[PDB]
Amino acid sequence: VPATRILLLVLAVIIYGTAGFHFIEGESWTVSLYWTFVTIATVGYGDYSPHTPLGMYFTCTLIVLGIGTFAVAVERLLEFLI
Amino acid sequence: VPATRILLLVLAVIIYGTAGFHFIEGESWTVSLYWTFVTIATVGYGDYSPHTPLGMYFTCTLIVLGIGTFAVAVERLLEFLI
Amino acid sequence: VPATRILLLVLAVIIYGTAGFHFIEGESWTVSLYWTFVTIATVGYGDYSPHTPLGMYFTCTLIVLGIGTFAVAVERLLEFLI
Amino acid sequence: VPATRILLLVLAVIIYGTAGFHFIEGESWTVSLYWTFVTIATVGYGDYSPHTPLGMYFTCTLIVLGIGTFAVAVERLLEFLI
Ligand SMILES: [K+]
Ligand SMILES: [K+]
Ligand SMILES: [K+]
Ligand SMILES: [K+]
């Protein structure tokens, strides 16, 4: 799949994750964006995490939709810098 | 391996993880499902984790049986939406 | 690489990780084994982690020697159950 | 890509991550090196993490530039030990 398409896909995941965390868990846009990257990259510091059932469900959806997309995006980015 | 078979395998892992954590560590079904995803996806927030020796042994079994299965499931899911 | 050789390699990693965390960080053998799996699988709950400079150095060595070995072991294990 | 080149690339990531965390978040050089490995390997214990907006932005940059580089480095290292 074209690298630029994979870029748009991961940007869409990032918007989804960030807006979701912001509105569901109430954290700031900046913290939510950070939490989104930390989650889809599978880092998972745990400094931020969902504390509501809706947030937990949402996080599972983000995990399923976002980890693979992020992994593909990283590997494509590798091809370009490297 | 057929995508639908991989689906059944990851659903089986999810049931195993969720019921195990619920019964061993005593967390609610919802928290246990969430913890299962967070674990097999290798996110590992650490907001929930086992606090008993049996829970620790169980978590190691889940890690070994579940991380690979979830990884294959994600990559198969990639192909379908993408 | 033969699957059984990969098994021995990951067992060697597990022994190294467990003994090291036990002796350097002072946690029980059981906690240390659990921490080793949680680390080399890249889950990283953070319920346990090194609190000394030697422990931090050691953990970096385990990360480098163990994450790859564990990942290959998992994928070979997938071939056998699946 | 030649293994030695991948080695230089991951060393550059490690320097970037370590110096960045040290200067932005104020942790010691040793803690910062440890945090860098824990982050780019995707372990993410969360015993250390950024607490400023600049640190969060920086961490996202390190995650994008470093996780892929580390993954390739680990797999090349595997080829040599194994
Ligand atoms: K983690
Ligand atoms: K991970
Ligand atoms: K993790
Ligand atoms: K954590």
Task: For this entry, give a set of tags.
Calcium-gated potassium channel MthK (chains A, B, C, D); Helix Hairpins; mainly alpha; 82 residues; 78% helix; binds potassium ion; homotetramer
Question: Would you summarize the structure shown here?
Answer:
The structure is a homotetramer of 82-residue chains. With 82 residues, chain A is an all-alpha fold. Chain A has helices at 3-25, 29-40, 53-81.
Structure description:
The structure is a homotetramer of 82-residue chains. With 82 residues, chain A is mainly alpha-helical. The first copy, chain A, has a single domain (1-82), classed as Helix Hairpins (Orthogonal Bundle). Helix content of chain A is 78%, strand content 0%. The first copy, chain A, is built from three helices and no strands. Chain A has helices at 3-25, 29-40, 53-81. The longest helix of chain A is centred in the last third of the chain and has 29 residues, at 53-81. Chains in contact: A-B, A-C, A-D, B-C, B-D, C-D. The interface between A and B is medium-sized, with 22 and 19 residues. One potassium ion sits between chains A (44-46) and B (44-46). It is classed as metal transport. The entry lists the keywords transmembrane ion channel family, potassium channel, metal transport. It forms a tetrameric assembly. MthK pore crystallized in presence of TBSb.
